[PDB]
Amino acid sequence: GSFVEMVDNLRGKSGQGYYVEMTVGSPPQTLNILVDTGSSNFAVGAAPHPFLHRYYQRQLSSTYRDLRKGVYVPYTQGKWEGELGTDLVSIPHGPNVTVRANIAAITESDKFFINGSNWEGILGLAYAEIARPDDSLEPFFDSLVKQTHVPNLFSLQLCGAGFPLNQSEVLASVGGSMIIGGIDHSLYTGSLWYTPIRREWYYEVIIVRVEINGQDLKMDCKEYNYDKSIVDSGTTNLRLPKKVFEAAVKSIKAASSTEKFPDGFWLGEQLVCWQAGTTPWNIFPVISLYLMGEVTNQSFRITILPQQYLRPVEDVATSQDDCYKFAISQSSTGTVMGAVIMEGFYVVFDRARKRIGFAVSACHVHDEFRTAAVEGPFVTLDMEDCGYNI
Ligand SMILES: CN1C(=N)N[C@@](c2cccc(-c3cncc(Cl)c3)c2)(C2CC2)C1=O
């Protein structure tokens, strides 16, 4: 482990997001910021909100610069409005550098902030193409690399606890690591396997095969990437295109058929509970996603367990049962490898070499009989045809 200052610098959980401490302004104002590989703006609460106990106060920063421009950002599940500016930003448990970065000061929002998430803003780590209002607003990581000697790479180890964390526990627990500018070997086991970044906008990848307990889903591989496949720390679930979700759920139901679960469970809405310690992990299948490799006609696979795709939740009766929600859900905007999938792996966002690496995480949840895996190589032909073009 060569990056001790950054190891264990994240907190949070898949349902509410993982965040890192940052400072903004002069004197520094401390804020907790969601790590989001699915967006490209650095946007922070800058006005009072019922769900915020702190926010960025521009009038108190001597280094604040107003860009005299507003930004309106609507999402599917919420929206916000803000004022653009720049200021000096640092990451206390990070590289020992301070940079001048763009900041969207959020003045109005709807369904954006989460009660009890403990974060006050978002750090969009994806590329300028998807920055708001347009690609001229340089994202944070691009500023960091341009202004310093930090290598153009970061890596994420998101650590799911494997059980519910109450309000106090989630604040006191280590949620993982964000290594800025490097790869920390203590965070994974086995080898790192890399898949190309198809295009630099989201962190887009190409899935070439899907198995449920070794059984090929057998769909045209273009379906797996319709209309894109991305790696997104800012989505909780593994999200699959509608037709892929329908085929995968049918296969997961068949593999787990010795127990019948209600429709609401498969819809990711209702929890399922078992007596303490008796969760029947073994009846649920493993899921393997094969990704395009860096060598021609070569792929590798990542394998996740039900300990990743069943998200621990507290029972409505705060009982002693062990309860979960199904964290695989349908999408109309492509595959999203969200936080519950990332919790199985150490993920290297190697921007310098336009590739994403995966290795088994040293903090993935498993049982005595099965573990997550990253394995290869496999011979896979015509992988380019798996990518979707509009
Ligand atoms: C899909 N997605 C992102 N990748 N980030 C967003 C976001 C915004 C606010 C909160 C969360 C969030 C909430 N709960 C759990 C998580 Cl993991 C993330 C995500 C948005 C900027 C585009 C969002 O909707």
Swiss-Prot record:
Q: How does it sit in the membrane?
A: Single-pass type I membrane protein
- What tissue expression does the UniProt record report for this protein? Expressed at high levels in the brain and pancreas. In the brain, expression is highest in the substantia nigra, locus coruleus and medulla oblongata.
Q: Tell me the ranges covered by the Peptidase A1 domain, including all copies.
A: 18-359
Q: Which residues carry this modification: N6-acetyllysine?
A: 69, 218, 222, 228, 242-243, 250
Keyword check for Ubl conjugation: yes
According to the record, mutating residue 36 to N results in: Decreases beta-cleaved soluble APP production
Q: List the disulfide bonds.
A: 159-363, 221-386, 273-323
Q: What is its EC number?
A: 3.4.23.46
Query: What is known about regulation of its activity?
Result: Inhibited by RTN3 and RTN4.
Instruction: Give me any GO biological process, just one.
Output: amyloid precursor protein catabolic process
Quote the catalytic residue positions: 36, 232
Its cellular-component GO annotations read:
axon; cell surface; dendrite; early endosome; endoplasmic reticulum lumen; endosome; endosome membrane; Golgi apparatus
Query: So which residues have sugars stuck on them?
Result: 96, 115, 166, 297
UniProt-annotated location(s): Cell membrane; Golgi apparatus, trans-Golgi network; Endoplasmic reticulum; Endosome
Question: Which key words are in the record?
Answer: Acetylation, Aspartyl protease, Cell membrane, Cell projection, Cytoplasmic vesicle, Disulfide bond, Endoplasmic reticulum, Endosome, Glycoprotein, Golgi apparatus, Hydrolase, Isopeptide bond, Lipoprotein, Lysosome, Membrane, Palmitate, Phosphoprotein, Protease, Signal, Transmembrane, Transmembrane helix, Ubl conjugation, Zymogen
Q: Which reaction does it catalyse?
A: Broad endopeptidase specificity. Cleaves Glu-Val-Asn-Leu-|-Asp-Ala-Glu-Phe in the Swedish variant of Alzheimer's amyloid precursor protein
Residues exposed to the Extracellular side: 1-390
What is the role of the protein in this entry? Responsible for the proteolytic processing of the amyloid precursor protein (APP). Cleaves at the N-terminus of the A-beta peptide sequence, between residues 671 and 672 of APP, leads to the generation and extracellular release of beta-cleaved soluble APP, and a corresponding cell-associated C-terminal fragment which is later released by gamma-secretase. Cleaves CHL1.
User: What is the name of this protein?
Assistant: Beta-secretase 1
